[PDB]
Design a protein around this ligand. Structure first.
Ligand SMILES: *C(=O)[C@@H]([C@@H]1NC(C(=O)O)=C(S[C@@H]2CN[C@H](CNS(N)(=O)=O)C2)[C@@H]1C)[C@@H](C)O
Length: 241
């Protein structure tokens, strides 16, 4: 009961940061962590926007799942970004360059319309189609991120069933003890204070879907693993894993 949520508050505390974890089962949401006010606070989606970025591109034939985005050879911030990748490969590695290319294919006209049509966050993408999710006006609360993941998990987003099933496969991580796990990590360092994301959902053995969105403040020098660690540890303590 209230004891399960006391360890979660310590999990964010032992990481020396303030964060929240939103869990949605059915149409009900529950928040955990040390800064519960974060659940209703808007932050830049960062790489979590790639979920919707891929849905728009595939639905409007801007790209395909087998298309290969060749690396130009210029040095990148991460070594995993220095390779030719399909849209799916770029999703796991969080290759900003590939989805900036896709965003330029979609264009500000279609990008802004589709974001508003789905109702993603504040639905304000500004005028630059290649950076609105990292620093731009686009902001979203962790509650809206978990609600988005739950709808994508059940394929109830306003996109074709084919496209939703393709983006789902891009986000598949692992199957831990019979539970299939889908998630998309995010890290917006170009906003102060920095924000850390981990949005996804769990497909339990009987098919039940449990969506989640971890949101914490990416402090200076904090390890990027903390997002995945707190999320996995929390779901285990919540009986979901
Ligand atoms: C989006 O948030 C941002 C990307 N995305 C991420 C992220 O949180 O995954 C990072 S951090 C870095 C990227 N690649 C590593 C994880 N993928 S991996 N291990 O290679 O499979 C960690 C970075 C800030 C924007 C720039 O896309």
């Amino acid at each position: 009961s209230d004891v399960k949520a006391e360890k979660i508050k310590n999990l964010f505390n032992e990481a020396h940061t303030t964060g929240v974890l939103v869990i949605q089962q059915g149409q009900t949401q529950q928040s955990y962590g040390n800064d519960l006010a974060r659940a209703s606070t808007e932050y830049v989606p960062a790489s979590t926007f790639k979920m919707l970025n891929a849905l728009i591109g595939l639905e409007h034939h801007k790209a395909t799942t087998t298309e290969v985005f060749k690396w130009d050879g210029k040095k990148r911030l991460f070594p995993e970004w220095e390779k030719d990748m399909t849209l799916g490969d770029a999703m796991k590695a969080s290759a900003i360059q590939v989805y900036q290319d896709l965003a330029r294919r979609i264009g500000l006209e279609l990008m802004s319309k589709e974001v508003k049509r789905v109702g993603y966050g504040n639905a304000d993408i500004g005028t630059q189609v290649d950076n609105f999710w990292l620093v731009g006006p686009l902001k979203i609360t962790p509650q809206q991120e978990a609600q988005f993941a739950y709808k994508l998990a059940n394929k109830t987003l306003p996109f074709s069933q084919k496209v939703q099933d393709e983006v789902q496969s891009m986000l598949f991580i692992e199957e831990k003890n019979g539970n299939k796990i889908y998630a998309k990590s995010g890290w917006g360092w170009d906003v102060n204070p920095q924000v850390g994301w981990l949005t996804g959902w769990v497909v339990q053995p009987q098919g039940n879907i449990v969506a989640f969105s971890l949101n914490l403040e990416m402090k200076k020098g904090i390890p990027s693993s903390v997002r995945k660690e707190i999320t996995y540890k929390s779901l285990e303590q919540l009986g979901i894993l």
